Design a binder for this molecule. Structure first.
Ligand SMILES: CCCCCCCCCCCC(=O)OC[C@H](COP(=O)(O)OCC[N+](C)(C)C)OC(=O)CCCCCCCCCCC
Ligand SMILES: CCCCCCCCCCCC(=O)OC[C@H](COP(=O)(O)OCC[N+](C)(C)C)OC(=O)CCCCCCCCCCC
Ligand SMILES: CCCCCCCCCCCC(=O)OC[C@H](COP(=O)(O)OCC[N+](C)(C)C)OC(=O)CCCCCCCCCCC
Ligand SMILES: CCCCCCCCCCCCC/C=C/[C@H](O)[C@H](N)CO
Ligand SMILES: CCCCCCCCCCCCC/C=C/[C@H](O)[C@H](N)CO
Ligand SMILES: CCCCCCCCCCCCC/C=C/[C@H](O)[C@H](N)CO
Lengths: 313, 313, 313
């Protein structure tokens, strides 16, 4: 089949930015600050089922491509941009584990047995152990020659793994992942300021919002480090809507689907903050960012399921 | 008038380093550690009135230059060194707001109504949103080609705004400004170590002392992060008196007036520290740095008001 | 004597990595987590006496070389690699002060009179004030042209001095040294990621483990910053055994003696952690790293005292 050679690894962004929506809707349904919203816990279940189906689809499709044409993911893995998209097949699974619907989780049973944390973070941790080792000892694939805004996709995995580790109960593994995540977020942040794409340049917002969420999941509250990182993420989000006013052009692509993952985590951190600092301005900010990320995911969805059908119908 | 084209933006340093003295004298008059000093609260009022008069003078003079010869501040704004001096016309106003004399503040009235924070930090926050956005997406004005010791003047604004926000009561805006200030202080600090002027090379001390003061104003006490930043500032101050022994030469200029702003904030942070850790060695250190910054401001003043009169008398 | 001109400054690593073993054995004998180990406090005393004898030997030998052939340590000091080994003659003394045997310390007497902190950290602090000043104002010896993995030897001194300052009682000097240590560890860490030796490339582990130990000595417990730095050090240790599997080759040298100092501090931080978080996996990790660093020091020792005798016997 000649279709599989044209199947990209960036198609996992469609599932990343769609399973990160199940988490946001679960938060909006369970947060005791957005309780004026008469939101149902059924929306989270529907979005999560859609995300899991999409993940299974683009995972079996990619397993077929990897087992049939192995020279193709080798050309896709030795790229400066498309090597960081090999973390999304595991971040998209950690985002399904974190946002498991309450109606679907076993009642009066095991609270997310930690096997789902290991089985999902080990393939990310090994790839990260290789990439972070190449960032030093690499000759041609050193960080100073590869550093791009899509390099934040290697770091986000650590904070999402910390959230999942906090969920499963292993708090110390969460602290380990958060430490090795911030230690390299500092490096990437400083190395990207020395050295304009619309969708993928916005990964500057997904790493600090995730670092704020992971610290609030590990340690119970939003204790000034979650706040430091969240306010850094909010400034990076505010300084991004200003350059690209939102009128970049008629562009709706699979790469544009990784324009929703940073906005959704930045809308989730602010929901946690609005339930941590219950003002009116903070609640309105969380309600604005949430309805701004959700509507973009919705339009991308009704656009994709349109192009998909009007291909040859 | 041909005088206005030769009027520099760096003349706002004369007001920055003179309104930062009203704050130091207010601290020396109100700190319950320097109470052996029989200092009067009238010195703070006199210095603050002088600073406000100087600010009004060099602000009306600069408004006239900007509204008459607009091609001049365009040549002054597109400079690597003189673009960071566009933050001082607002930091010098925040330093008047923070150090309002107790005798002049309305008794039994509003405690610094937060309009003075917005009206004074908005023009700084917009310019900062533009500069920090250019540090990434700029072609010729990127940070790696502009980074100089005077680039710390973009960061100090955040910490001074955090102090003012803590004063007006909006603590969360203070935390926001402190977060977006430290996030870029790390970048500037690391980018200035890769790549010797006497007065302006000393901006390495004004940013950490201000970051220590802002954290102590936001959170009530001097809780180990104020201490980390203050000790970093003290080491940078100690490692500066050693290179330039203080005998750089017979040099007393308007650029030398931005040699007092870093020393004054580093003398203010140590007053806060001496009232936080009440030893003898700490009190003597605060009393040494205070009398070392104040005497330099005094000699610069009696030198400037001398050249000013002996021009043509 | 023609032998002295061939005497290297890196010979102080033999004492650094051997006096850092007295501390590890004292910890293993005094930690209330490794109490299943029937370890004796006599092993710490024996190792400390050996370390002090070696230090006196290679210090008198080097004083003779410095006072006889002064043109040689000038050629050794103006090197990019061998200028950072001028901190080890003081870190090796701070490691004797920190790990003084309990049987040898005066009972019911002064608790490490702080003169041993000043007399041992002043020669390090002056050299550090010079090197850190050159990292900015240097023309040919700037950091961007000198930064190598052995540059972490300038930073470790700060954290070891913080531990010693906490021991002697001067906690605020410890906080000062920790602040000026982390401020430059961030710089070195970020500047080494832009720009493979076996023994000296492993200094990436000695600085964060020491920064974790210093924060736990200053502030009583292992409070999440010690944990952040220790987990960063543990990841850097885990990502180092993987590249060099431990089979680099038949190499046992004086430079290989500075392959034990990072592993020993990383085995000491994990002993502190295992006494802070008393699980089984953490205790086994501390017992693994300890018996992995100690056996390497032991084999290096029985190898050195073999080559030394079989030279000409
Ligand atoms: C083993 C080689 C790797 C070394 C790094 C280990 C991480 C820190 C060790 C501390 C041990 C400890 O004591 O804590 C770790 C915890 C047990 O503690 P807890 O139940 O969470 O504490 C109590 C908190 N309650 C009360 C809330 C429950 O179990 C673990 O998560 C095991 C970690 C598995 C490996 C994690 C490494 C990360 C890479 C993932 C590879 C699959
Ligand atoms: C709005 C778009 C900008 C997004 C960034 C907002 C900052 C954080 C929001 C948290 C809201 C909150 O809940 O706190 C913010 C506080 C209200 O809380 P508080 O009274 O201080 O808490 C109680 C503490 N007491 C008990 C001590 C009093 O009000 C504000 O300062 C409004 C902030 C105005 C905008 C600040 C943005 C900075 C740029 C300046 C532009 C003029
Ligand atoms: C002097 C020019 C250098 C400026 C930097 C000074 C460091 C911070 C000053 C705070 C003073 C203070 O108040 O604390 C410092 C302490 C006294 O406090 P403490 O007993 O530990 O607190 C009580 C804690 N207990 C209750 C547990 C005991 O004494 C000192 O360690 C003096 C420091 C000597 C110089 C340190 C500079 C580092 C370079 C080393 C050069 C030899
Ligand atoms: C780039 C190398 C250094 C990387 C690390 C930089 C920052 C490390 C510490 C940041 C996170 C620690 C925040 C402190 C939290 C408090 O101590 C409380 N214990 C929170 O529980
Ligand atoms: C350059 C990218 C990362 C920038 C951020 C680096 C450091 C971020 C945290 C430093 C400040 C947090 C200090 C922690 C304070 C404690 O948690 C207490 N809650 C203080 O109230
Ligand atoms: C490179 C320039 C910036 C360097 C500093 C970066 C991090 C500075 C703060 C890290 C250490 C502070 C951790 C905070 C501890 C808590 O506030 C508690 N008070 C601990 O006692």
């Amino acid at each position: 089949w000649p279709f599989l050679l044209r199947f990209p690894i960036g198609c996992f962004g469609v599932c990343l930015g769609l399973g990160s929506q199940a988490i946001l809707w679960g938060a909006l349904a369970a947060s005791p600050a957005m309780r004026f919203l008469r939101v149902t816990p059924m929306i989270n279940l529907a979005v999560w089922l859609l995300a899991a189906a999409v993940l299974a689809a683009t995972s079996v499709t990619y397993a077929l491509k990897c087992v049939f044409y192995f020279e193709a993911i080798r050309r896709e893995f030795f790229h400066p941009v498309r090597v960081n998209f090999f973390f999304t097949p595991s971040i998209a699974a950690m985002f399904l584990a974190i946002g498991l619907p309450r109606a679907l989780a076993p009642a009066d049973g095991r609270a997310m047995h930690p096997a789902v944390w290991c089985a999902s973070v080990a393939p990310l941790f090994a790839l990260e152990l290789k990439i972070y080792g190449q960032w030093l000892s690499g000759g041609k694939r050193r960080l100073c020659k590869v550093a791009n805004p899509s390099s934040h996709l290697s770091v986000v995995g650590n904070f999402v793994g910390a959230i999942l580790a906090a969920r499963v109960g292993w708090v110390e593994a969460g602290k380990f992942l958060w430490a090795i995540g911030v230690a390299h977020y500092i490096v990437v942040f400083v190395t990207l300021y020395q050295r304009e794409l619309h969708p993928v340049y916005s990964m500057f917002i997904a790493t600090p919002s995730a670092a704020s969420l992971a610290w609030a999941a590990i340690y119970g509250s939003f204790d000034a480090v979650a706040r430091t990182f969240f306010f850094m993420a909010l400034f990076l989000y505010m300084s991004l809507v200003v350059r690209i006013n939102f009128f970049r052009g008629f562009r709706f692509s699979i790469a544009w689907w990784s324009y929703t993952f940073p906005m959704t985590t930045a809308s989730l951190a602010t929901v946690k903050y609005a339930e941590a600092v219950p003002c009116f301005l903070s609640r309105a900010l969380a309600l604005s960012l949430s309805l701004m990320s959700t509507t973009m995911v919705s339009l991308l969805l009704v656009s994709t399921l349109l192009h998909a059908f009007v291909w040859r119908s």
